[PDB]
Coordinates of N, CA and C and ligand atoms in Angstrom, one line a residue:
X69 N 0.8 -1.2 0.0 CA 0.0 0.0 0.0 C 0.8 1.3 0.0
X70 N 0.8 2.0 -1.3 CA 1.5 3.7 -0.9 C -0.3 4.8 -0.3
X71 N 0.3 5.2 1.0 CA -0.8 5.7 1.3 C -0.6 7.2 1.3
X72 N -1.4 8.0 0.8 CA -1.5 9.5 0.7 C -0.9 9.9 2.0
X73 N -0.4 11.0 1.5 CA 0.3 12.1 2.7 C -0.7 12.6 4.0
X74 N -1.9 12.7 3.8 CA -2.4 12.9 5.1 C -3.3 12.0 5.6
X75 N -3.4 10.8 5.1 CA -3.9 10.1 5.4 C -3.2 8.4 6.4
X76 N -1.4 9.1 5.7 CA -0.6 8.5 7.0 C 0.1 9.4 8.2
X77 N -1.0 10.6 7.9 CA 0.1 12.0 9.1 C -1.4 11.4 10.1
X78 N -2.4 11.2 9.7 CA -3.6 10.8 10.6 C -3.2 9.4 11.3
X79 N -2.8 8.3 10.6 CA -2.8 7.3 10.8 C -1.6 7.2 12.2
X80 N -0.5 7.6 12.0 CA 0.9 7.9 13.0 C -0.1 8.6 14.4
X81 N -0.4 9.9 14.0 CA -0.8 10.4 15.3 C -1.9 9.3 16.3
X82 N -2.6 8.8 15.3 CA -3.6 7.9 16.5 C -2.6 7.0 16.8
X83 N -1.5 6.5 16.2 CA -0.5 5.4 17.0 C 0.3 6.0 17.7
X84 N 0.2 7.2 18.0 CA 1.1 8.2 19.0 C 2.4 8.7 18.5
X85 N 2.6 8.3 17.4 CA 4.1 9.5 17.1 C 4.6 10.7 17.0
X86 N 3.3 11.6 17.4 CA 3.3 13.1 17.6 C 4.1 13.4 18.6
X87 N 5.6 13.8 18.3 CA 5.9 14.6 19.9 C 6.6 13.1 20.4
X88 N 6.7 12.1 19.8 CA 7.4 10.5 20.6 C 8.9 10.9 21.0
X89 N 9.8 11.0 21.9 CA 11.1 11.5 22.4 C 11.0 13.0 21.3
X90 N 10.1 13.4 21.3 CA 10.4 15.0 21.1 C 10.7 14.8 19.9
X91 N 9.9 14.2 18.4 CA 9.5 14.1 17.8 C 8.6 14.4 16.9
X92 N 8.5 15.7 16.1 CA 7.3 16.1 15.3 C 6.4 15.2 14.3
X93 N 5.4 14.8 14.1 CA 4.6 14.5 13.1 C 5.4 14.8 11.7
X94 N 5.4 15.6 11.6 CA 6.3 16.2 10.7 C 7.2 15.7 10.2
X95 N 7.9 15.5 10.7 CA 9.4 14.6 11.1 C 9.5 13.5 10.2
X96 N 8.7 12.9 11.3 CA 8.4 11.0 11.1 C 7.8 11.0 9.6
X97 N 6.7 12.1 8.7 CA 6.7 11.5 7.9 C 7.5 12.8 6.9
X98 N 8.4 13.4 6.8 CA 9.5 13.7 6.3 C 10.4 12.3 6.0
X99 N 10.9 11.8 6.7 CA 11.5 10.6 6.7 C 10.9 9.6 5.9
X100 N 9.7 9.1 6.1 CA 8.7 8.3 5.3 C 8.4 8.4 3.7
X101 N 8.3 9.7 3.7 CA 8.4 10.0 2.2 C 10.2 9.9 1.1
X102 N 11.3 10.3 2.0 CA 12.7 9.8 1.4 C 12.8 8.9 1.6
X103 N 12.7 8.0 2.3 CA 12.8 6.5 2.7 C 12.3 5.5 1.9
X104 N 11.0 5.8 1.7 CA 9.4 4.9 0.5 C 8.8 5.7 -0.2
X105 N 8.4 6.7 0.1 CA 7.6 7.3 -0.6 C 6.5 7.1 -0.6
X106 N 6.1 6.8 1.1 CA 5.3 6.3 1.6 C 4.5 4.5 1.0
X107 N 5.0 4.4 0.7 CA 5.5 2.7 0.7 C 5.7 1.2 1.1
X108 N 4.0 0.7 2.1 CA 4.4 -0.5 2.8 C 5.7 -1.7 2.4
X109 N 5.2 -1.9 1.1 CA 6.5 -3.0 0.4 C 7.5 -2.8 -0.3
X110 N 8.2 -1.3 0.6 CA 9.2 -1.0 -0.3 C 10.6 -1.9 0.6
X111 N 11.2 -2.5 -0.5 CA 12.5 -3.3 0.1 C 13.5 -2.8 -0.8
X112 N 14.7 -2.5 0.0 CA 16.1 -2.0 -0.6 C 17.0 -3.0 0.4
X113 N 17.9 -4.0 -0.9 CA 19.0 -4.7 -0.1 C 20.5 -4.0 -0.5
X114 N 21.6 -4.2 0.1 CA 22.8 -4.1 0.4 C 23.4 -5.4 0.2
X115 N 24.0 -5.0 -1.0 CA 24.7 -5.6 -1.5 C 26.1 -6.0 -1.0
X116 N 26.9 -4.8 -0.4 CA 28.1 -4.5 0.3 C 27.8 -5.6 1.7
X117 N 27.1 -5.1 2.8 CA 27.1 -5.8 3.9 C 25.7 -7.0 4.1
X118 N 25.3 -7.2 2.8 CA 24.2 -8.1 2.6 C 23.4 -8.0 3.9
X119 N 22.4 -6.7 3.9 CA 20.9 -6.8 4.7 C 20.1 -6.1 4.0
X120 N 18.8 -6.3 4.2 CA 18.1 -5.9 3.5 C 16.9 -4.5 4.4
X121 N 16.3 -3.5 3.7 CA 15.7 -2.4 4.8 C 14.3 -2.8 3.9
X122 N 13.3 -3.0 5.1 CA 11.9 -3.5 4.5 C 11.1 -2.2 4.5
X123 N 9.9 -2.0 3.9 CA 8.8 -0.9 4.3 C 8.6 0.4 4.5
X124 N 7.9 1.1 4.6 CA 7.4 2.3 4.9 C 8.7 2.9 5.6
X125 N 9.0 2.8 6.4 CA 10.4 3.4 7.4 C 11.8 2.6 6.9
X126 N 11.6 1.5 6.4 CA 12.7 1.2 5.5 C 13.7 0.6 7.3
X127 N 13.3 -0.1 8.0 CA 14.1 -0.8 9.0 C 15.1 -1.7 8.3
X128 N 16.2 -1.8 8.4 CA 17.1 -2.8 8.1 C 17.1 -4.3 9.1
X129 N 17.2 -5.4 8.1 CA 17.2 -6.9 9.2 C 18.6 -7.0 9.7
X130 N 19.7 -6.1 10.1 CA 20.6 -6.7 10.9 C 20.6 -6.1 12.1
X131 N 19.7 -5.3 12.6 CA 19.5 -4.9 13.7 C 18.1 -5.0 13.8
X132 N 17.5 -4.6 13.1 CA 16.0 -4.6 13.9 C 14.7 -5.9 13.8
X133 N 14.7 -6.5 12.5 CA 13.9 -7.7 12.5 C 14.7 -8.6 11.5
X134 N 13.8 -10.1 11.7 CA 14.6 -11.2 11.3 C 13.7 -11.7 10.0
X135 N 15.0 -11.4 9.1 CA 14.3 -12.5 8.1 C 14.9 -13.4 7.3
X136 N 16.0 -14.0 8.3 CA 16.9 -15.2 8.6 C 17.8 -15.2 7.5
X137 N 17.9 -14.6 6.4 CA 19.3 -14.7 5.5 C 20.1 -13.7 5.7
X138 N 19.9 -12.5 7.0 CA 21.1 -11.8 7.2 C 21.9 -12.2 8.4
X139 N 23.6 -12.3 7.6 CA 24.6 -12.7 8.9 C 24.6 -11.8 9.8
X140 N 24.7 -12.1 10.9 CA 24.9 -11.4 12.0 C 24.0 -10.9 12.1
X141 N 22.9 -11.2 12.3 CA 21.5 -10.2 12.8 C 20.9 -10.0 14.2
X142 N 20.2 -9.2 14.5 CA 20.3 -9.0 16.0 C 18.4 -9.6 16.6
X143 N 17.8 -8.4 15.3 CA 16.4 -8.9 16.2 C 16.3 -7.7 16.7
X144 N 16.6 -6.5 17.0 CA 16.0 -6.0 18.7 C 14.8 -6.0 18.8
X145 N 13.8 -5.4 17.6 CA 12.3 -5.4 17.7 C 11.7 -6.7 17.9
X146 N 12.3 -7.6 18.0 CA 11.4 -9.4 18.4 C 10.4 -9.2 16.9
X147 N 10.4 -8.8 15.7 CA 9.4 -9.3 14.7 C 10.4 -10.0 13.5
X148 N 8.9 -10.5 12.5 CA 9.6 -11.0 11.7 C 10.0 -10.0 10.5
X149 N 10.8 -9.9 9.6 CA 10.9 -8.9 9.0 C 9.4 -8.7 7.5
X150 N 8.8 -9.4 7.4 CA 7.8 -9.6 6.6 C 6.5 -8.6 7.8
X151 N 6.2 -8.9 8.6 CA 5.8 -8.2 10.0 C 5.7 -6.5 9.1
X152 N 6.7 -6.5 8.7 CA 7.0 -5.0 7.8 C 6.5 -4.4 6.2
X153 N 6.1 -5.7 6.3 CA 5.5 -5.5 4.5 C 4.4 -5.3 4.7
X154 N 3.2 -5.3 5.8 CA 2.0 -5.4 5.8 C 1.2 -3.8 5.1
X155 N 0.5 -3.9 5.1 CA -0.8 -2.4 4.5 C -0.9 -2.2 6.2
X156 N -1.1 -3.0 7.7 CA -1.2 -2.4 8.4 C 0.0 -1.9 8.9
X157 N -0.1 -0.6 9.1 CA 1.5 -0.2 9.9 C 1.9 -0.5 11.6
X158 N 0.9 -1.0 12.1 CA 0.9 -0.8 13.5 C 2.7 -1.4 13.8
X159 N 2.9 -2.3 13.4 CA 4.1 -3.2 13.7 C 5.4 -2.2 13.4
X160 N 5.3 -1.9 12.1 CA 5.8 -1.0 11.9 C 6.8 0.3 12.8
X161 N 5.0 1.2 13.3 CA 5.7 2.0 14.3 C 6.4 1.6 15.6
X162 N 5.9 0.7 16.1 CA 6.3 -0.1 17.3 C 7.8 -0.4 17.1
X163 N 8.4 -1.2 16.2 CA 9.9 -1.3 15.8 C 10.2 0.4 15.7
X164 N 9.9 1.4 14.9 CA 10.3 2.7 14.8 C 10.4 3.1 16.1
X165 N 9.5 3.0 17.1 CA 10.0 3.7 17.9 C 10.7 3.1 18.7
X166 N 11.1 1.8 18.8 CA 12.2 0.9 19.1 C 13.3 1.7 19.1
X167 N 13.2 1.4 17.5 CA 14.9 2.6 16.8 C 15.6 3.3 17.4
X168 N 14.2 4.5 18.2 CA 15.1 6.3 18.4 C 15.4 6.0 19.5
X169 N 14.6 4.7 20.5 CA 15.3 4.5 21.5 C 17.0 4.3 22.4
X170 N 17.5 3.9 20.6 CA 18.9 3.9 21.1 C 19.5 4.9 20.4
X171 N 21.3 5.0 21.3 CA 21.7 5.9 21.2 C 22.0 7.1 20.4
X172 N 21.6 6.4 18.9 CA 21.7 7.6 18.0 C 20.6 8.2 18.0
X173 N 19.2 7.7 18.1 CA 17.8 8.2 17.8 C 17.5 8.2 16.6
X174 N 16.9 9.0 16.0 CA 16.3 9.0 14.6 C 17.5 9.2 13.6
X175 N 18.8 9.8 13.8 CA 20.0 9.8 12.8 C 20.2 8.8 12.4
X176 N 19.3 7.3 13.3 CA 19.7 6.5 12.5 C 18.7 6.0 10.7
X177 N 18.3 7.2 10.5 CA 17.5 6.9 9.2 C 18.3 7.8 8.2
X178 N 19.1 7.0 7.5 CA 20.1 8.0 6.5 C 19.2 9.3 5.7
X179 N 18.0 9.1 5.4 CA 17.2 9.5 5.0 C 16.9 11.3 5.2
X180 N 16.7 11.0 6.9 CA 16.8 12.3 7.6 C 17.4 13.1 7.9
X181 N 18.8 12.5 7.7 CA 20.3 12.8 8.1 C 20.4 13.9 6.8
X182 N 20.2 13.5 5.8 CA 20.2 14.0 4.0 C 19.1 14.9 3.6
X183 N 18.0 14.9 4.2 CA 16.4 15.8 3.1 C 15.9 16.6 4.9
X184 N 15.8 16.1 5.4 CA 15.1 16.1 6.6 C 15.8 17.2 7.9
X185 N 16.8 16.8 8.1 CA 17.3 17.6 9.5 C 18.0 19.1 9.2
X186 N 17.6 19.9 10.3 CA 17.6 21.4 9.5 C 16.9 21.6 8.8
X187 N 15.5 21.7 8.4 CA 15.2 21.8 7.4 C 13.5 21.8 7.7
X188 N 12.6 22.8 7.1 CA 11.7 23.2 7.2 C 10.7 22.5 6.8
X189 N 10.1 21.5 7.7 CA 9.4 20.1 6.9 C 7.5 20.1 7.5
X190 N 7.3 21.5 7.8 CA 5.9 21.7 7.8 C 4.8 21.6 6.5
X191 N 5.4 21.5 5.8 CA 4.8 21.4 4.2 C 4.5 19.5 4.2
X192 N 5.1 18.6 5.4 CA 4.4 17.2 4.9 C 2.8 17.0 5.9
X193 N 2.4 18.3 6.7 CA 1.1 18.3 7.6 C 0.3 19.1 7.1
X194 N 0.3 20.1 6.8 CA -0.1 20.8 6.1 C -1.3 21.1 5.6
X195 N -2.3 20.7 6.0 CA -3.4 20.8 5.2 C -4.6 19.0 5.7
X196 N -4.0 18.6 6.8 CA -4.4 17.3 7.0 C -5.3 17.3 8.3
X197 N -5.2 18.2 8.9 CA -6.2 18.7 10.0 C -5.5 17.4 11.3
X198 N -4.2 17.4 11.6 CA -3.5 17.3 12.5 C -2.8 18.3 13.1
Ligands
LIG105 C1 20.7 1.7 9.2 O1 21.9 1.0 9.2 C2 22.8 1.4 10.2 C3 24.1 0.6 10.0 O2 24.4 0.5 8.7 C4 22.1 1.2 11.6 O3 22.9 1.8 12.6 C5 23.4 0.9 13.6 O4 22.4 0.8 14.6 C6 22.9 -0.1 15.6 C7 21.7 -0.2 16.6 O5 21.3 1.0 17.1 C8 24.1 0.5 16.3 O6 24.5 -0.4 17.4 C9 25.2 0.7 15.3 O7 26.3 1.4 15.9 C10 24.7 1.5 14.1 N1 25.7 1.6 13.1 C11 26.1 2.8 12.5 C12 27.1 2.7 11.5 O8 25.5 3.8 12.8 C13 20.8 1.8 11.6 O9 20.1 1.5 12.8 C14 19.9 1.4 10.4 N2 18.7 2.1 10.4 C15 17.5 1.5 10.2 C16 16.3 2.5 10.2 O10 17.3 0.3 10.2

Protein backbone atom coordinates (compact mmCIF):
# COMPACT_ATOMS: atom_id res chain seq x y z
CA UNK A 1 0.00 0.00 0.00
CA UNK A 2 1.47 3.70 -0.85
CA UNK A 3 -0.78 5.72 1.27
CA UNK A 4 -1.51 9.49 0.65
CA UNK A 5 0.30 12.09 2.71
CA UNK A 6 -2.38 12.90 5.09
CA UNK A 7 -3.89 10.12 5.39
CA UNK A 8 -0.56 8.52 6.95
CA UNK A 9 0.08 11.98 9.08
CA UNK A 10 -3.58 10.80 10.57
CA UNK A 11 -2.77 7.28 10.84
CA UNK A 12 0.85 7.91 12.96
CA UNK A 13 -0.80 10.38 15.32
CA UNK A 14 -3.63 7.86 16.54
CA UNK A 15 -0.52 5.39 16.95
CA UNK A 16 1.08 8.21 18.98
CA UNK A 17 4.14 9.53 17.06
CA UNK A 18 3.29 13.14 17.58
CA UNK A 19 5.94 14.55 19.92
CA UNK A 20 7.40 10.45 20.58
CA UNK A 21 11.08 11.47 22.36
CA UNK A 22 10.41 14.96 21.14
CA UNK A 23 9.54 14.13 17.81
CA UNK A 24 7.32 16.07 15.32
CA UNK A 25 4.60 14.50 13.14
CA UNK A 26 6.30 16.20 10.67
CA UNK A 27 9.36 14.61 11.09
CA UNK A 28 8.35 11.02 11.06
CA UNK A 29 6.72 11.54 7.87
CA UNK A 30 9.46 13.70 6.28
CA UNK A 31 11.51 10.62 6.73
CA UNK A 32 8.67 8.35 5.31
CA UNK A 33 8.40 10.04 2.17
CA UNK A 34 12.74 9.76 1.38
CA UNK A 35 12.82 6.53 2.72
CA UNK A 36 9.42 4.90 0.47
CA UNK A 37 7.56 7.34 -0.56
CA UNK A 38 5.29 6.27 1.65
CA UNK A 39 5.51 2.68 0.70
CA UNK A 40 4.44 -0.52 2.76
CA UNK A 41 6.49 -2.96 0.40
CA UNK A 42 9.16 -0.98 -0.34
CA UNK A 43 12.50 -3.30 0.14
CA UNK A 44 16.12 -2.05 -0.59
CA UNK A 45 19.05 -4.69 -0.06
CA UNK A 46 22.84 -4.10 0.44
CA UNK A 47 24.72 -5.61 -1.51
CA UNK A 48 28.11 -4.52 0.32
CA UNK A 49 27.11 -5.80 3.91
CA UNK A 50 24.20 -8.08 2.64
CA UNK A 51 20.93 -6.75 4.65
CA UNK A 52 18.13 -5.92 3.46
CA UNK A 53 15.67 -2.44 4.76
CA UNK A 54 11.93 -3.51 4.55
CA UNK A 55 8.79 -0.93 4.26
CA UNK A 56 7.37 2.32 4.92
CA UNK A 57 10.43 3.39 7.37
CA UNK A 58 12.68 1.22 5.49
CA UNK A 59 14.12 -0.81 8.96
CA UNK A 60 17.11 -2.84 8.11
CA UNK A 61 17.19 -6.87 9.23
CA UNK A 62 20.64 -6.75 10.91
CA UNK A 63 19.53 -4.90 13.68
CA UNK A 64 16.02 -4.60 13.86
CA UNK A 65 13.89 -7.71 12.50
CA UNK A 66 14.62 -11.20 11.35
CA UNK A 67 14.31 -12.46 8.07
CA UNK A 68 16.85 -15.16 8.62
CA UNK A 69 19.28 -14.74 5.52
CA UNK A 70 21.08 -11.75 7.25
CA UNK A 71 24.58 -12.68 8.94
CA UNK A 72 24.94 -11.39 11.99
CA UNK A 73 21.53 -10.23 12.81
CA UNK A 74 20.32 -8.99 16.01
CA UNK A 75 16.36 -8.88 16.19
CA UNK A 76 15.97 -5.96 18.66
CA UNK A 77 12.32 -5.36 17.68
CA UNK A 78 11.44 -9.40 18.42
CA UNK A 79 9.42 -9.33 14.69
CA UNK A 80 9.64 -10.98 11.67
CA UNK A 81 10.92 -8.88 9.00
CA UNK A 82 7.85 -9.62 6.63
CA UNK A 83 5.75 -8.20 9.96
CA UNK A 84 6.98 -4.96 7.78
CA UNK A 85 5.48 -5.52 4.47
CA UNK A 86 1.96 -5.37 5.82
CA UNK A 87 -0.79 -2.43 4.52
CA UNK A 88 -1.18 -2.43 8.39
CA UNK A 89 1.51 -0.17 9.90
CA UNK A 90 0.92 -0.78 13.54
CA UNK A 91 4.07 -3.23 13.70
CA UNK A 92 5.85 -0.96 11.90
CA UNK A 93 5.65 2.00 14.27
CA UNK A 94 6.29 -0.10 17.25
CA UNK A 95 9.88 -1.30 15.80
CA UNK A 96 10.25 2.67 14.81
CA UNK A 97 9.99 3.69 17.95
CA UNK A 98 12.15 0.87 19.15
CA UNK A 99 14.91 2.55 16.84
CA UNK A 100 15.11 6.33 18.37
CA UNK A 101 15.29 4.50 21.50
CA UNK A 102 18.89 3.86 21.12
CA UNK A 103 21.68 5.86 21.20
CA UNK A 104 21.74 7.60 17.96
CA UNK A 105 17.85 8.18 17.77
CA UNK A 106 16.35 9.04 14.65
CA UNK A 107 19.99 9.85 12.81
CA UNK A 108 19.66 6.51 12.47
CA UNK A 109 17.49 6.89 9.23
CA UNK A 110 20.11 7.97 6.49
CA UNK A 111 17.19 9.49 4.97
CA UNK A 112 16.81 12.35 7.61
CA UNK A 113 20.34 12.78 8.14
CA UNK A 114 20.25 14.03 4.03
CA UNK A 115 16.40 15.76 3.12
CA UNK A 116 15.08 16.10 6.59
CA UNK A 117 17.29 17.62 9.47
CA UNK A 118 17.56 21.40 9.50
CA UNK A 119 15.24 21.85 7.39
CA UNK A 120 11.68 23.15 7.25
CA UNK A 121 9.35 20.10 6.94
CA UNK A 122 5.86 21.68 7.77
CA UNK A 123 4.79 21.43 4.20
CA UNK A 124 4.41 17.23 4.87
CA UNK A 125 1.08 18.32 7.60
CA UNK A 126 -0.06 20.81 6.13
CA UNK A 127 -3.39 20.78 5.22
CA UNK A 128 -4.40 17.34 6.98
CA UNK A 129 -6.18 18.68 9.99
CA UNK A 130 -3.53 17.32 12.48
C1 LIG B 1 20.70 1.70 9.16
O1 LIG B 1 21.93 0.99 9.16
C2 LIG B 1 22.79 1.41 10.21
C3 LIG B 1 24.09 0.64 10.04
O2 LIG B 1 24.39 0.49 8.66
C4 LIG B 1 22.13 1.17 11.56
O3 LIG B 1 22.95 1.75 12.58
C5 LIG B 1 23.45 0.93 13.56
O4 LIG B 1 22.44 0.78 14.56
C6 LIG B 1 22.85 -0.09 15.64
C7 LIG B 1 21.68 -0.23 16.57
O5 LIG B 1 21.29 1.04 17.06
C8 LIG B 1 24.09 0.49 16.34
O6 LIG B 1 24.51 -0.40 17.36
C9 LIG B 1 25.22 0.70 15.32
O7 LIG B 1 26.33 1.36 15.93
C10 LIG B 1 24.72 1.55 14.15
N1 LIG B 1 25.75 1.63 13.13
C11 LIG B 1 26.05 2.78 12.53
C12 LIG B 1 27.14 2.73 11.47
O8 LIG B 1 25.49 3.83 12.81
C13 LIG B 1 20.75 1.83 11.61
O9 LIG B 1 20.13 1.48 12.83
C14 LIG B 1 19.90 1.38 10.42
N2 LIG B 1 18.66 2.14 10.36
C15 LIG B 1 17.47 1.54 10.25
C16 LIG B 1 16.26 2.46 10.18
O10 LIG B 1 17.34 0.31 10.21
Amino acid sequence: KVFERCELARTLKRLGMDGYRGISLANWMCLAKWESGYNTRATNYNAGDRSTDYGIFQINSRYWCNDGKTPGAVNACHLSCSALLQDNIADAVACAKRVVRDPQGIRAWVAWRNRCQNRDVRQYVQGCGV
